[PDB]
Design a protein around this ligand. Structure first.
Ligand SMILES: *[C@@H]1O[C@H](CO)[C@@H](O[C@@H]2O[C@H](CO)[C@@H](O)[C@H](O)[C@H]2NC(C)=O)[C@H](O)[C@H]1NC(C)=O
Ligand SMILES: *[C@@H]1O[C@H](CO)[C@@H](O[C@@H]2O[C@H](CO)[C@@H](O)[C@H](O)[C@H]2NC(C)=O)[C@H](O)[C@H]1NC(C)=O
Ligand SMILES: *[C@@H]1O[C@H](CO)[C@@H](O)[C@H](O)[C@H]1NC(C)=O
Ligand SMILES: *[C@@H]1O[C@H](CO)[C@@H](O)[C@H](O)[C@H]1NC(C)=O
Length: 425
């Protein structure tokens, strides 16, 4: 009476059905919580929260017309079998079982899949396979707490997964950087909290459909990008990272914003002042803001030095040290003669970037040593206005252009800059 009958017997044998599930009929299309279409092919199997033990039969993918498979909150163990024959499957919900592995070709063949929830299964550790690019209808993917390792694959772009909306990969063991193909996507919910992701979060600024993002508890560094395109952003949680730099005004000014968690980073400049409808999680002293008063301006020397750090790319080493509103109190590389900043010394600090023209606003400076780094660009002419400057040593970088003329009394060391004096087109 049906092409799926024999595979359904395999399923009935491999599951220890609880007792209020009646699968006794000779016709599996009449089984409880099983649905068939007009041609007697199985289209839905929905055994929700029954605590059922057993396994999945390895011929499950023979149910080629299966559309809905919901078995979450049971105690089903063993491997998840090959699912590539389930080309009409729209929903796969297996969360909170006892499955111990996923097929290595997961997503292959699954051209109708809209949503997949596997979270909280004790899987053997696995990398998200590149066959995820075959699940071109995917909208919801929750693989949180699934023992995933490796990197986020670069297959979440729009010409692969144009419908992807809710990507939840919380509490795995992912590492590495955010994929570039996140740029231009229409992901609306991104949960990557609680693992080992690192690098820059600038790609967020090209994710203009984002409504909710949590990067909480990773190793992201660098500044928060320009977010002025994220006109629907409501929840922004980047708690417990290594973010540095000034909180951009484009984030503080988003009218859609509802909730912001910045606690436990190395953010610099003034504590930001969000709108008063915003729930704000910024606990005193758990960043590197100049004061703990939201909206309070910094000391102008602090503003100047943060601009200097900006052109170094906001290194974590400076942000961890440059705390409070007085640069004369134990800031690394900063020496003062009673209130006046007199020395900026960052020799051999692996610095990349340029020298900010703002450095010339520290008008009491007597020595600048930036030797033995990886800086480039021009030496700013504004430095020649430093009337008390006696030594500018930029040895062993990659500066170019015309070296400015300092007064007779300034010692300028530019040796080791191969392209110094080169100023052609
Ligand atoms: C994809 O995930 C979203 C959750 O972000 C689902 O939308 C929610 O569904 C629940 C049902 O459990 C409703 O109570 C919520 O009101 C929905 N929230 C919305 C619509 O913003 C959605 O159903 C999932 N599936 C698909 C196919 O999109
Ligand atoms: C992110 O910050 C928000 C805002 O401070 C936190 O939301 C608060 O959570 C507790 C729970 O009762 C209460 O202080 C308030 O009810 C919430 N305020 C709101 C919703 O505006 C939220 O807990 C933080 N998230 C994390 C993961 O730490
Ligand atoms: C994560 O999954 C494991 C099973 O591997 C489970 O014991 C644990 O409760 C899950 N954690 C959460 C927060 O659900
Ligand atoms: C980020 O993590 C990867 C993988 O562990 C590592 O190879 C890379 O050097 C890290 N990058 C940064 C900037 O920390």
């Amino acid at each position: 009476t049906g092409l799926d009958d024999s595979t359904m017997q395999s399923l009935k044998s491999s599951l220890n059905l609880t007792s209020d599930v009646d699968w006794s009929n000779p016709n599996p299309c009449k089984w409880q919580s099983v649905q068939c279409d007009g041609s007697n092919r199985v289209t839905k199997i929905q055994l929700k929260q029954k605590g059922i033990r057993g396994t999945l039969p390895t011929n499950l993918q023979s149910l080629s017309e299966l559309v809905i498979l919901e078995l979450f909150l049971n105690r089903i163990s063993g491997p998840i079998p090959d699912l590539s024959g389930l080309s009409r499957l729209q929903t796969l919900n297996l969360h909170d079982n006892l499955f111990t592995s996923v097929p290595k070709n997961l997503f292959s063949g699954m051209s109708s899949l809209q949503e997949m929830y596997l979270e909280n299964n004790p899987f053997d550790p696995w990398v998200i396979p590149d066959t995820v690019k075959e699940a071109t209808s995917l909208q919801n993917l929750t693989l949180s707490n699934c023992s995933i390792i490796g990197k986020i694959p670069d297959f979440f772009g729009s010409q692969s997964l144009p419908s992807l909306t809710n990507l939840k990969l919380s509490q795995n063991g992912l590492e590495g950087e955010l994929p570039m193909s996140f740029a231009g996507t229409s992901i609306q919910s991104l949960f990557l909290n609680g693992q080992k992701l690192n690098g820059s979060i600038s790609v967020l600024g090209n994710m203009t459909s984002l409504v909710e993002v949590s990067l909480q508890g990773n190793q992201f560094s660098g500044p928060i990008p320009d977010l002025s395109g994220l006109v629907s952003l409501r929840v922004f949680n980047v708690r417990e990272n290594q973010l540095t730099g000034v909180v951009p005004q484009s984030l503080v000014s988003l009218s859609s914003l509802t909730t912001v968690n910045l606690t436990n980073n190395y953010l610099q400049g003034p504590t930001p002042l969000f709108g008063k409808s915003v729930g704000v999680d910024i606990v005193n002293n758990m960043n590197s803001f100049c004061t703990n008063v939201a909206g309070e301006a910094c000391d102008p020397r602090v503003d100047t030095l943060v601009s200097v750090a900006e052109s170094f790319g906001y290194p974590v080493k400076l942000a961890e040290s440059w705390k409070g509103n007085n640069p004369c109190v134990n800031w690394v590389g900063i020496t003062c003669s009673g209130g006046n900043i007199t020395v900026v010394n960052m020799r051999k600090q692996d610095l990349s970037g340029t020298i900010s023209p703002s450095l010339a606003k520290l008008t009491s400076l007597e020595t600048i040593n930036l030797a033995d780094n990886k800086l480039s660009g021009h030496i700013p002419d504004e430095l020649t206005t430093l009337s008390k400057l006696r030594l500018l040593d930029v040895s062993n970088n990659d500066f170019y252009g015309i070296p400015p003329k300092f007064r007779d009394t300034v010692t300028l060391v530019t040796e080791g800059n191969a392209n110094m004096g080169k100023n052609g087109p």
